[PDB]
Structure 1
Amino acid sequence: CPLMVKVLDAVRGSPAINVAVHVFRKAADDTWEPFASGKTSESGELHGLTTEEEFVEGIYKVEIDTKSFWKALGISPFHEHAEVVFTANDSGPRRYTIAALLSPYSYSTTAVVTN
C-alpha cells in the first residue's frame, strides 16, 4: 500500500465517507493520464489505489471530489474539488498518505511520507 488517501470532515468531526477520489499521472506528452480511483470507506480512508510495481516515479495529481461530498450533505461549498499535485518516488519507493481536512469554504491537505 504505497498510496493511501484519508479524508476528514471538520464540520462534524468525523471521517468523510464515500468521497470520490481520482488519481492521475503526468504522461510523456504533458497530459494528465488516469491512474487510479476509488471512494473512501467508513473510516474516511481509501486503500488499494495502487501497487508498488505500478506506482513508478512521476508527477501525480490526487483529486478529491469535495463538492459532491458537501452537496450530498445539503451544503453549497466554495471549491469544485481539492487537488494535490506532487512528484513521487524520485528518490526511490516511499509510502505516501495524502490527508485532507474539509470545511465548506476551506480545506487543508497534508502528506505523510515514510520509508
Structure 2
Amino acid sequence: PLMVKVLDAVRGSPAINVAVHVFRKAADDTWEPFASGKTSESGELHGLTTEFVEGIYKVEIDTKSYWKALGISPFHEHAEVVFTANRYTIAALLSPYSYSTTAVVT
C-alpha cells in the first residue's frame, strides 16, 4: 500500500537509484526504521510494506546523494515527508534548490 515515485526536473526523467528510508514514529517520539530501498529505472520504489497500520510515518528521500552523483550542487540534505496513515503514492519532483512532494491516495 506504499509506493514512492521520484522525478528529476533538470533532466526530465525518472530519478533513478535514489535511496529512500521509511520510519514509523514510536511511542517515545523517536523514529524507528521501517523499510528502505532505491528507486528503479522508472523512478519508482514498490514493495516497502504490506504491517502498515495507522500511525505517523516519515519517508526520507536522499536527494543530496542523488545530485552529488550527477555532479550538481544541491541545497537540501534530503526531502522528508511526514504523514499519518489512516493506496499511498508519495511523489516527489526534484530540482537542486527546490522540490515538491504530492500524496496520491487512491
TM-score range, shorter chain: over 0.9
1:76, CA displacement in angstroms? 1.2
Q: Does 1:82 align with 2:79?
A: yes
**Is 1:100 aligned with 2:57?**
no
The 1-side partners of 2:28 and 2:77 are apart by 26
Distance 1:40 1:30 in 2: 28
- 1:1-31 C-alpha deviation (Å, 9 max, x unpaired): x000000000010000000000000001111
Q: Distance in 1 between matches of 2:47 and 2:73?
A: 30
If the length of structure 1 is used for normalisation, what is the TM-score? Answer: 0.91
Distance 1:50 1:42 in 2: 20
Q: Deviations over 1:25-81 (max 9, x none)?
A: 000111100000000000000000000xx0010000000000000000001100000
Aligned residues: 106
Tell me how far apart the structure 1 counterparts of residues 2 and 88 of structure 2 sit (CA, whole Å): 5
Distance in 2 (CA, whole Å) between partners of 1:70 and 1:30 is 31
The secondary structure found in structure 2 opposite 1:59 is strand
Distance in 1 of aligned mates of 2:81 and 2:30: 16
- Partner SS for 2:33: strand
What SS class does the counterpart of residue 29 from structure 2 fall into? coil
Q: State the identity as a percent.
A: 99
- Return structure 1 stretches of 4+ with deviation > 6 angstroms: none
Q: RMSD of the TM alignment (CA)? A: 0.4
